[PDB]
Design a protein around this ligand. Structure first.
Ligand SMILES: [Mg+2]
Ligand SMILES: [Zn+2]
Ligand SMILES: [Zn+2]
Lengths: 301, 1259
C-alpha cells in the first residue's frame, strides 16, 4: 500500500517463474487434460464419485496452470500497455484492459500452434488495448469505425506533413483518404476533445473558464415581462370582440390551451359546422385586422 | 427552515434519492449531440434536455405534460428538473469513504482499534483481516487437533530417521565401492565428501520444513479477530492447513463485515472501565475512542455508513457538458471522474462474471477504490488524478472548500443585478447626502422604473416601445430619468469596505460626464482618494430596502466613526487649511488696520474689501442680540450700576474678522469660538455639534464649513517654490564640525585603537545627535507664515519629520535585512541626494512597500477571523438582571496635593453605564445608569474619587445574549445602543480597520534573536489566538524564597513557596537576564524574568479578571504605540468570547468526558442538574483559547463550515448527527432568510399598521 499504485502492482507481480518451452507445453497439456476432465464432468451421464473427484482435481490443476501462465505474462501485457500510454487513458487502466485481453488470449491458445505464447498473445493484447482505448478514452464516445477513420487520416496527414514539409491542402488530403472533402471536414471536426471549465482563466485566481460563459436557459426577465404584457393586451383585445368570436379565435390559436384546434375541431364543443366555424374565424381575422385593434399589437410583433 | 439535520447517508437512502441507475459511461452521441441512454446525462433518469420534450420524437408539446412515453421513458416536464434529479451507481464491490478515513483520528475515531497503517494496508489490498473466528470451536476440539499434530510430528521424525539411515547406507556403500575400485588415489574420500554434503543439504530442508510446520501451528494458536496477515502466502497456508474456523477477507468488504458485526456497546463499557483505571497517553487514546464510539451509540444511524455501497451522481445540469461555438466543448471534471468510476465498476463486473484470478480481481477492486477516492477527494493520497496532466482534476470536496469553494464564493459573497461601477471625481457643490451618477449609468440602473414612467406618461405607446425608446436614448427618456431617480437612495460602496461606513446611502443626481461625483467630506470615510479610484453603486429595490437606505445608511446620519466615537466626516486636506488660515493670530501678514473697532461685522467686511483691514488683525467687533458669547466671556460683562445679562445681548469683543466669519458659519445658538481652529479643535467643535444639535443642523453646519474652507484655502495662497523651502544656513557649518569629529574617529580607528563595532556604534550615536540638532535648528529657522508651516501645523496634511527630510538631511537609513549604515545621508531632497545615497534610500523604500503589502494581507485575514468569531453576539434584552460591575481607574498619576485624571480615560470609561451610584460627601454625585461625558467626569475628578464601578459586558448576566445597558451607549450614534444592533460585527470591524495603519516594526534586531518580543500586527494576532508568546517569562506560583542555580549546562531558578508548600523548580535560558534577587522573598503575581506573560497561566492562578485586564491593556498599548485608538468595549466583547468555554475536570458524577472544552452555560446547566439529582458537581476550570478554536467549536456546524476549515468540521458534524439550529447570523445569510439582528427581529417585524379614527373622519 503506497502512492503511485502502479509500483505496488509491479511489486505484486513479484518474482514468478518464467516459462521455457517444455514447461509451457506441459502446462498447456495439463490445461487440455483439465478441459476434458470438466467436459466429462459436465455430461449428465452418471460417473463414479471417485473418478469425478479425480477429474475435478485435474481441472483444478489446469486452472492453477492457467493462473501460472497469466502471472507469467503480466510482464508482457504491461509492456504492451506502456506501448500505448499517454493517449488519455490512465496507464494502470490500460494495463487492466490488456489483462482482460490476455485472459481472452489464454482462453484461445493451445500448443497445436508451433509458436510461443509471446507471439500469439501480443495480437490479442493489442486488440483489447486498442478497442478499449477507442471506446473509453474520449469524453464524447466515438464509434470504433470513426476512431479508425480519424486516426488513419491523422497518421497519413502527419506523413504528408513529413514529406511535403508543409500543411497539406484539404483537396490533397481528400484524394489521399480517397473520400470527399466533406467527409474530411466532418471527421476533422469530430476528432476534437473538450476543454475543462475549471481551468485558470488567465489571471492569478480570477475564477475559472466556467465563470465567464453565459447560459441560454436563463429566462431573460425583459422577455418574460414583455411576453406577459403581450398576453394581457391580446386577451383584452379578444375581450373587445364578441364572446363567440373571441372564443372561436382563441380555440383556433390555442390561447387557453397550448394546442390550437382545427376549424372542424372547434365545431364539436361549440356546435357549429366546419365551414360555419371557418367563416366566423375568417370574420374574426378580418375584424382584428382593422386598424382599430392593431395599433397596440403592432408594437409587440 | 428550522434545522439542517446532517448525517451519514446509508445505501438505502442513496437508493431512495436516485430516480434510476447509471450503467454506462456514455455521455452524448458524437453526431446528434443528444444524451445517450442510461449513461450520464440520460433523460430517462435525470430529465428532459428541452422543456417538456422527450427523446424519441413522440409526445412533444406543453399540453400533455406529466406523462411518461413508453418509447424512451423520458418524463415530460420542465428542463429545470435536470438541476434537481440525481442518480446513483451500484458498485460490484463496496468501497470506503475517503473522508471518514485518511484523516485526523477525530473523524476516523478509532472505531476499530487499528492503527492508520493497518487500514491503509488493508483497504488498498495489501493484507488480510480475520473478520471472525470460532475460537470457542477451536478450543473445544483442542485435544483432537493436538493429537493429530503429535502424530504428524511422530511420522515426520520416523520418515526423517529412515532418510538418515538411507543416507548413511548410501555414504558407506559409495565409499566402500570406490575404495575397492581404486580408479585414482583417493576416489573414496571425494565421494564421501559429496555424500556428507548431500546429507547436510537434506538436513537443511528438514529443518526448513520443521520450521514451517512450527510457524503455522503457532499462528493457529495465535488466532484472534482483527488480526492482520501481511504475508499472502502465510494466509494461504492458514486457509489450507485449517478451514471452517477462521473467516478472512481483504479490502473494504472486510471492513463492512467487521462494522456489521461490531458491538460498540461492549467497547464503550470496557473503555469506561479503562478510563476509570488508566494512565499515560493510553488514557487520551481511550478518551478519543469513547468520544467517537459514544457519538455513534447515541445517534440512531448505524456505523456501516462508513463503507458506502452506492455512489450518488450529481445532477447533470450542475456538471454541464455545455455546447460551445466552434464545434468545441466544455466539460467539468466531475464528468471525467464519474466516467472513471463507471468504467472501473463495469470492468470489475465483467471480471467477476467470468472465472478470473484473485490477483486481477483484487487489483481491480483497488482500482475502483482509488477511483471513488479521487471522485470524493482527489489528491488526498499520493499524487492526484491529474487528468489532462496540466492541472489536478477538480473533485466533489474541492468545490466545497477553499477561497474558490462554494461556501465563501457563492453563498456569502454573491454577484448582484442592478448595480454599476465607475471612477470617482470630487464634487464640492453637492450637499452631504447627494452623489452624482453619469447619465448612462443612471439610465441603465433604472431601466424598469424608466420604462414604467414612460408608459404611464404616454411618451411610449407600450412596454416594448418603451424598451426601444430607452435603448435609443431620446431626450424624453432623460427627462423621465431626471423625474424618477429623485427620492430613491443608492448605496455607494468601495471595494475594501473596512468598516460599516464603507456602504453609504445617497440621493442620486444626474450629471454630465462619465464619473461618479462625490462629496469631499465623506471621502475620508471611504478612505477613497482621487488619484484614481472606482466605487460601486448598488440599488435598494424593495420598499423595506429603500426605507433602510433612507433611515439607517444615510450619509448624513453617520457623522461619528464607530471605532471610538469621534467625527470622521470632517476631512482636513484642504478645508482645514482654509479655516486655519481664517482663524489665525497676527503676524500672518503685515497686520494693517490693527487697533480699531467696527460697528458690526458687515462694516468690518466692507473695510476688508477696501483693503485697509486685513483678515488677520485684532479689532473690537460688536454682535447683534442673540449672539451667544465665548464660554469664557460669560463672567466678564459690561460695566453698569444696573443688572445686565450679556449671555444673550449685545457685547463688543476683541477678536478678528476671521473668527467672526467662522462663528457665523456655525449656528447662532452655538457659543462663540475665539481660538485658532487647526484640526484638533475643529474635531472638538464638530463633536460638540453632533452631541448637542439635531442631525440636519449638523449637516448644514458641515456644508457651510466646507464652503468657507475651500474659499479661504483658495485665498490662502499656499504654494510651493524653490525659494519656499529654505535650507537652514547653520546646517553646513554644524555638519562639517561633525565630519571633523567623524574623520578624527576614523583616524584613530586606522591605528587599531578602537574595534570596528565600537566605531560603528559611536558613529551611529554621533549622527543621531547631529540629525536631532539639525532638526531642531530647521524647526527654529522656518517662519510661521510659509505654506509648509501653515499646512503642517494646521493638521491639513504632512508631518514634521517629512519637512525635516525635505529641508534637513535625511539621517540614518536602514540597511538591508535591518541594519544601520555607518554613513547617513547628509543631503535633503531639496539639494538632491547623491547616487549611492539614493540607492541606500531605495533599500528602505522597497522594503517599506513589501512590508505594507504583507501587513494589509494579514490585516484582512485578522479582520475575517475576528468577524467570524464575534458573530452571534446581538443585543437581545433591554436591561440586565444583575448589579455586579467592573472596577476602573478614573484618575491616576495624581501629583502631590492634586488630582489628575487618567491620560487615556476616553477609551476606558467613557460611554459606559455606572452599575451603582456614588456618594463621597454623603450626597449622590453621579446617578446610576447614566453614560459618562466631560461634565460628569470633571465633577467626579474634582470631588476626588479615585475609582469607579462601571457596568460592562463582561459582568453582564443576561439569559439571552447581552443586555443593552451593559454594552452602554453606541459610539456611531451617541445614544443608548438600540436592541438588536450587531455589536459583534462592529467590534470586529473596529478592531480590524487600523490593521493596515499599524505598520510598526522593530527598527533593528540589535544582533540578538529571541530577546525583543513580537511587535505590531503579529503581536495583536498572537494575543487574539491565545498563542504562547515568543518571549515567555514564567510567573511566580505563590510567595516564598527564590534563588538561582547557575548550572554549567543551563541556568535554573528554584523557588520554595512559603508555608511549607511544595518546592517548584522553573527552567530558564542561560542568558536569563532576570531581576529578582537570589534567596529572596517573592510574591504571587510578579514575573520571574523579562518577557511577555503567558495568558494561560495568568488565567490559571490570578483569575479571569486578571487575564481580561491583561489582554485589554496589552492590545490597547500595541494599538496606541502607532497612535490609533479604539474603545475598550470592542476588545471586551471578543475577550468574553474567548473565555466562554471551560475545561471539565473530575468528570465523575457529571458522567461526561474529563478534560474537554464545554460551554459555560452548558456547564452551569449540567451542574444544576447533577446537584438537584444529589450527585456532587463535576469540577471545571476556565480555559482561554484563540478565536479560531472558539469559532470552530461552535454549535452551528453550518457557520463553522462557512469558516476556513470545511472538511473536518463537516465530517464531525455528519458523524455527530447534529442539527444546525438557525439561530445566529452567518448561517441565516447562507439560507437567504432574514438575519436576526436589527430589522430582522421578531418584535420589530410583527407590528401592524392602521390610521386613527379621526384621520378617517377628516378624510
Ligand atoms: Mg485610491
Ligand atoms: Zn419519447
Ligand atoms: Zn447586562
Amino acid at each position: 500500500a503506497t502512492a503511485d499504485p502502479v509500483k505496488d502492482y509491479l511489486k505484486q507481480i513479484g518474482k514468478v517463474p518464467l516459462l521455457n518451452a517444455e514447461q509451457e507445453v506441459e502446462l498447456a497439456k495439463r490445461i487440455e487434460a483439465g478441459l476434458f476432465a470438466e467436459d466429462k464432468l459436465a455430461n449428465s451421464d452418471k460417473l463414479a464419485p471417485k473418478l469425478k473427484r479425480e477429474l475435478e482435481i485435474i481441472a483444478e490443476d489446469g486452472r492453477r496452470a492457467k493462473n501460472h501462465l497469466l502471472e507469467a505474462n503480466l510482464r508482457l501485457v504491461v509492456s504492451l500497455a506502456k506501448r500505448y500510454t499517454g493517449r488519455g487513458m490512465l496507464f494502470l487502466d490500460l494495463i487492466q484492459e490488456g489483462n482482460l485481453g490476455l485472459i481472452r488470449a489464454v482462453e484461445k491458445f493451445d500448443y497445436t500452434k508451433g509458436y510461443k505464447f509471446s507471439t500469439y498473445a501480443t495480437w490479442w493484447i493489442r486488440q483489447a488495448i486498442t478497442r478499449a482505448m477507442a471506446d473509453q478514452a474520449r469524453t464524447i464516445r466515438i464509434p470504433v469505425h470513426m476512431v479508425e477513420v480519424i486516426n488513419k487520416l491523422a497518421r497519413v496527414q502527419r506523413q504528408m506533413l513529413q514529406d511535403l514539409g508543409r500543411e497539406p491542402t484539404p483537396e490533397e488530403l481528400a484524394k489521399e483518404l480517397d473520400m470527399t472533402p466533406e467527409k474530411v471536414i466532418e471527421v476533422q471536426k469530430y476528432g476534437r476533445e473538450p476543454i475543462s471549465l475549471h481551468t485558470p482563466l488567465g489571471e492569478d485566481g480570477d475564477s475559472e473558464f466556467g465563470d465567464l460563459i453565459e447560459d441560454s436557459e436563463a429566462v431573460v426577465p425583459a422577455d418574460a415581462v414583455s411576453f406577459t404584457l403581450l398576453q394581457e393586451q391580446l386577451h383584452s383585445v379578444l375581450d373587445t370582440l364578441s364572446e363567440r368570436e373571441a372564443g372561436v379565435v382563441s380555440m383556433r390559436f390555442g390561447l387557453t390551451d397550448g394546442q390550437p384546434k382545427t376549424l372542424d375541431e372547434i365545431g364539436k364543443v361549440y356546435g357549429v359546422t366546419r365551414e360555419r366555424i371557418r367563416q366566423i374565424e375568417s370574420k374574426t381575422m378580418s375584424k382584428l385586422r382593422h386598424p382599430s385593434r392593431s395599433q397596440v399589437l403592432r408594437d409587440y410583433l | 427552515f428550522d434545522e439542517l439535520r446532517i448525517g451519514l447517508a446509508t445505501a438505502d437512502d442513496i437508493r431512495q434519492w436516485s430516480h434510476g441507475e447509471v450503467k454506462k459511461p456514455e455521455t452524448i452521441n458524437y453526431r446528434t449531440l443528444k444524451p445517450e441512454k442510461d449513461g450520464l446525462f440520460c433523460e430517462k433518469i435525470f430529465g428532459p434536455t428541452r422543456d417538456w420534450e422527450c427523446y424519441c420524437g413522440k409526445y412533444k408539446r406543453v399540453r400533455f405534460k406529466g406523462i411518461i412515453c413508453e418509447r424512451c421513458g423520458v418524463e415530460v416536464t420542465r428542463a429545470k428538473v435536470r438541476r434537481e434529479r440525481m442518480g446513483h451507481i451500484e458498485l460490484a464491490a463496496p468501497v470506503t469513504h475517503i473522508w471518514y478515513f485518511k484523516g485526523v483520528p477525530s473523524r476516523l475515531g478509532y472505531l476499530l482499534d487499528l492503527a492508520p497503517k493497518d487500514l491503509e494496508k488493508v483497504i488498498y489490498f495489501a493484507a488480510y483481516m480475520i473478520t471472525f473466528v470460532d475460537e470457542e470451536r477451536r478450543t473445544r476440539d483442542l485435544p483432537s487437533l493436538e493429537a493429530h499434530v503429535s502424530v504428524e510430528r511422530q511420522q515426520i521424525e520416523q520418515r526423517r530417521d529412515s532418510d538418515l539411515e538411507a543416507r548413511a547406507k548410501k555414504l558407506e556403500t559409495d565409499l566402500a565401492e570406490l575404495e575397492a575400485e581404486g580408479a585414482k588415489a583417493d576416489v573414496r574420500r571425494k565421494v564421501r565428501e559429496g555424500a556428507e554434503r548431500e546429507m547436510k543439504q537434506l538436513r537443511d530442508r528438514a529443518q526448513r520444513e520443521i520450521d514451517r510446520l512450527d510457524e503455522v501451528w503457532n499462528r493457529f494458536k495465535n488466532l484472534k479477530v482483527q488480526d492482520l496477515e501481511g504475508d499472502e502466502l502465510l494466509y494461504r497456508e492458514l486457509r489450507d492447513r485449517f478451514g471452517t474456523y477462521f473467516d478472512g477477507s481483504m479490502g473494504a468488504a472486510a471492513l463492512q463485515k467487521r462494522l456489521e458485526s461490531f458491538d460498540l456497546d461492549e467497547e464503550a463499557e470496557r473503555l469506561r472501565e479503562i478510563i476509570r483505571t488508566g494512565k499515560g497517553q493510553k488514557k487520551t487514546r481511550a478518551l478519543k475512542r469513547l468520544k467517537v464510539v459514544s457519538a455513534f451509540l447515541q445517534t440512531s444511524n448505524s456505523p456501516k455508513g462508513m463503507v458506502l455501497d452506492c455512489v450518488p451522481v450529481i445532477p447533470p445540469d450542475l456538471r454541464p457538458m455545455v455546447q460551445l461555438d466552434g464545434g468545441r466543448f466544455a466539460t467539468s471534471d466531475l464528468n471525467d471522474l464519474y466516467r472513471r468510476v463507471i468504467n472501473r465498476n463495469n470492468r470489475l463486473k465483467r471480471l467477476l462474471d467470468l472465472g478470473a484470478p484473485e490477483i486481477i480481481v483484487n487489483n481491480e477492486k483497488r482500482m475502483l477504490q482509488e477511483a471513488v477516492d479521487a471522485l470524493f477527494d482527489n489528491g488526498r493520497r499520493g499524487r492526484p488524478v491529474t487528468g489532462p496532466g496540466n492541472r489536478p482534476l477538480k473533485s466533489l470536496s474541492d468545490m466545497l472548500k477553499g477561497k474558490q469553494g462554494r461556501f465563501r464564493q457563492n453563498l456569502l459573497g454573491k454577484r448582484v443585478d442592478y448595480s454599476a461601477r465607475s471612477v470617482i471625481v470630487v464634487g464640492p457643490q453637492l450637499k452631504l447626502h447627494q452623489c452624482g451618477l453619469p447619465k448612462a449609468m443612471a439610465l441603465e440602473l433604472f431601466k424598469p422604473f424608466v420604462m414604467k414612467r414612460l408608459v404611464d406618461l404616454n411618451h411610449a405607446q407600450n412596454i416594448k416601445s418603451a424598451k426601444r425608446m430607452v435603448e435609443r436614448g431620446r431626450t424624453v427618456v432623460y427627462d423621465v430619468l431626471e423625474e424618477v431617480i429623485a427620492e430613491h437612495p443608492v448605496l455607494l460602496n468601495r471595494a475594501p469596505t473596512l468598516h460599516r461606513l464603507g456602504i453609504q446611502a445617497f440621493e442620486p443626481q444626474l450629471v454630465e460626464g462619465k464619473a461618479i461625483q462625490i462629496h469631499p467630506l465623506v471621502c475620508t470615510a471611504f478612505n477613497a482618494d482621487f488619484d484614481g479610484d472606482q466605487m460601486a453603486v448598488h440599488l435598494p429595490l424593495s420598499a423595506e430596502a429603500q426605507a433602510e437606505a433612507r433611515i439607517l445608511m444615510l450619509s448624513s446620519n453617520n457623522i461619528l466613526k464607530p471605532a471610538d466615537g469621534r467625527p470622521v466626516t470632517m476631512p482636513t486636506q484642504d478645508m482645514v487649511l482654509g479655516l486655519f488660515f481664517l482663524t489665525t493670530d497676527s503676524e500672518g501678514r503685515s497686520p494693517k488696520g490693527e487697533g480699531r473697532a467696527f460697528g458690526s461685522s458687515a462694516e468690518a467686511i466692507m473695510a476688508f474689501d477696501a483693503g485697509d483691514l486685513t483678515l488677520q488683525a485684532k479689532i473690537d467687533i460688536r454682535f447683534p442680540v442673540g449672539t451667544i458669547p465665548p464660554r469664557g466671556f460669560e463672567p466678564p460683562a459690561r460695566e453698569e450700576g444696573e443688572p445686565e445679562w450679556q449671555q444673550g445681548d449685545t457685547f463688543t469683543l476683541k477678536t478678528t474678522l476671521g473668527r467672526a466669519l467662522f462663528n457665523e458659519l456655525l449656528p447662532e445658538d452655538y457659543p462663540f469660538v475665539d481660538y485658532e481652529v487647526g484640526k484638533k479643535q475643529l474635531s472638538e467643535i464638530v463633536n460638540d455639534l453632533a452631541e448637542r444639535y439635531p442631525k440636519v443642523i449638523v449637516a448644514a453646519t458641515l456644508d457651510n464649513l466646507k464652503a468657507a474652507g475651500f474659499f479661504w484655502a483658495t485665498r490662502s495662497g499656499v504654494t510651493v517654490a524653490i525659494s519656499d523651502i529654505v535650507v537652514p544656513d547653520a546646517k553646513k557649518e554644524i555638519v562639517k564640525g561633525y565630519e571633523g569629529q567623524d574623520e578624527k574617529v576614523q583616524k584613530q580607528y586606522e591605528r587599531g585603537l578602537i574595534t570596528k563595532e565600537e566605531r560603528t556604534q559611536e558613529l551611529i550615536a554621533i549622527w543621531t545627535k547631529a540629525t536631532n540638532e539639525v532638526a531642531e535648528a530647521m524647526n527654529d529657522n522656518f517662519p510661521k507664515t510659509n505654506p509648509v508651516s501653515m499646512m503642517v501645523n494646521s493638521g491639513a496634511r504632512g508631518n514634521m519629520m517629512q519637512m525635516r527630510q525635505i529641508a534637513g538631511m535625511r539621517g540614518l537609513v536602514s540597511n538591508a535585512k535591518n541594519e544601520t549604515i555607518p554613513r547617513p545621508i547628509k543631503a535633503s531632497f531639496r539639494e538632491g541626494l547623491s547616487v549611492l545615497e539614493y540607492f541606500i534610500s531605495t533599500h528602505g523604500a522597497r522594503k517599506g512597500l513589501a512590508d505594507t503589502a504583507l501587513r494589509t494581507a494579514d490585516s484582512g485575514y485578522l479582520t475575517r477571523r475576528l468577524v467570524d468569531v464575534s458573530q452571534d453576539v446581538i443585543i437581545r434584552e433591554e436591561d440586565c438582571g444583575t448589579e455586579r460591575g467592573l472596577k476602573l481607574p478614573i484618575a491616576t498619576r495624581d501629583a502631590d496635593g492634586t488630582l489628575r485624571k487618567a491620560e487615556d480615560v476616553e477609551t476606558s470609561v467613557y460611554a459606559r453605564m455606572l452599575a451603582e451610584d456614588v456618594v463621597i460627601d454623603g450626597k449622590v454625585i453621579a446617578p446610576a445608569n447614566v453614560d459618562l461625558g466631560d461634565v460628569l467626569i470633571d465633577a467626579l475628578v474634582a470631588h476626588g474619587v479615585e475609582e469607579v464601578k462601571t457596568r460592562s459586558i463582561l459582568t453582564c448576566e443576561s439569559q439571552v445574549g447581552t443586555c443593552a445597558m451593559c454594552y452602554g451607549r453606541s459610539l456611531a450614534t451617541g445614544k443608548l445602543v438600540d436592541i438588536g444592533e450587531a455589536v459583534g460585527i462592529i467590534a470586529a470591524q473596529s478592531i480590524g480597520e487600523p490593521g493596515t495603519q499599524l505598520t510598526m516594526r522593530t527598527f533593528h534586531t540589535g544582533g540578538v534573536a529571541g530577546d525583543d518580543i513580537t511587535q505590531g500586527l503579529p503581536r495583536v494576532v498572537e494575543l487574539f489566538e491565545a498563542r504562547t508568546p515568543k518571549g515567555v517569562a514564567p510567573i511566580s506560583e505563590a510567595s516564598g524564597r527564590v534563588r538561582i542555580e547557575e548550572t554549567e549546562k543551563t541556568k535554573k531558578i528554584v523557588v520554595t513557596p512559603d508555608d511549607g508548600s511544595d518546592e517548584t523548580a522553573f527552567p530558564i535560558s542561560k542568558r536569563a537576564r532576570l531581576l529578582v534577587g537570589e534567596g529572596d522573598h517573592v510574591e504571587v503575581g510578579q514575573k520571574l524574568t523579562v518577557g511577555a506573560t503567558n495568558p494561560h497561566d495568568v488565567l490559571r492562578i490570578l483569575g479571569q479578571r486578571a487575564v481580561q485586564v491583561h489582554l485589554v491593556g496589552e492590545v490597547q498599548k500595541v494599538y496606541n504605540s502607532q497612535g490609533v485608538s479604539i474603545h475598550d468595549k470592542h476588545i471586551e466583547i471578543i475577550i468574553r468570547q474567548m473565555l466562554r468555554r471551560v475545561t471539565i475536570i473530575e468528570s465523575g458524577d457529571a458522567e461526561l468526558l474529563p478534560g474537554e472544552l464545554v460551554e459555560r452555560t452548558k456547564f452551569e446547566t449540567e451542574n444544576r442538574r447533577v446537584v438537584q439529582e444529589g450527585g456532587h458537581p463535576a469540577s471545571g476550570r476556565p480555559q482561554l483559547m484563540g478565536i479560531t478554536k472558539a469559532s470552530l467549536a461552535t454549535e452551528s456546524w453550518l457557520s463553522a463550515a462557512s469558516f476556513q476549515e470545511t472538511t473536518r468540521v463537516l465530517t464531525d458534524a455528519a458523524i455527530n448527527a447534529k442539527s444546525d439550529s438557525l439561530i445566529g447570523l452567518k448561517e441565516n445569510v447562507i439560507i437567504g432568510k432574514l438575519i436576526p439582528a436589527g430589522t430582522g427581529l421578531s418584535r420589530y417585524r410583527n407590528i401592524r399598521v392602521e390610521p386613527t379614527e379621526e384621520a378617517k373622519a377628516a378624510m
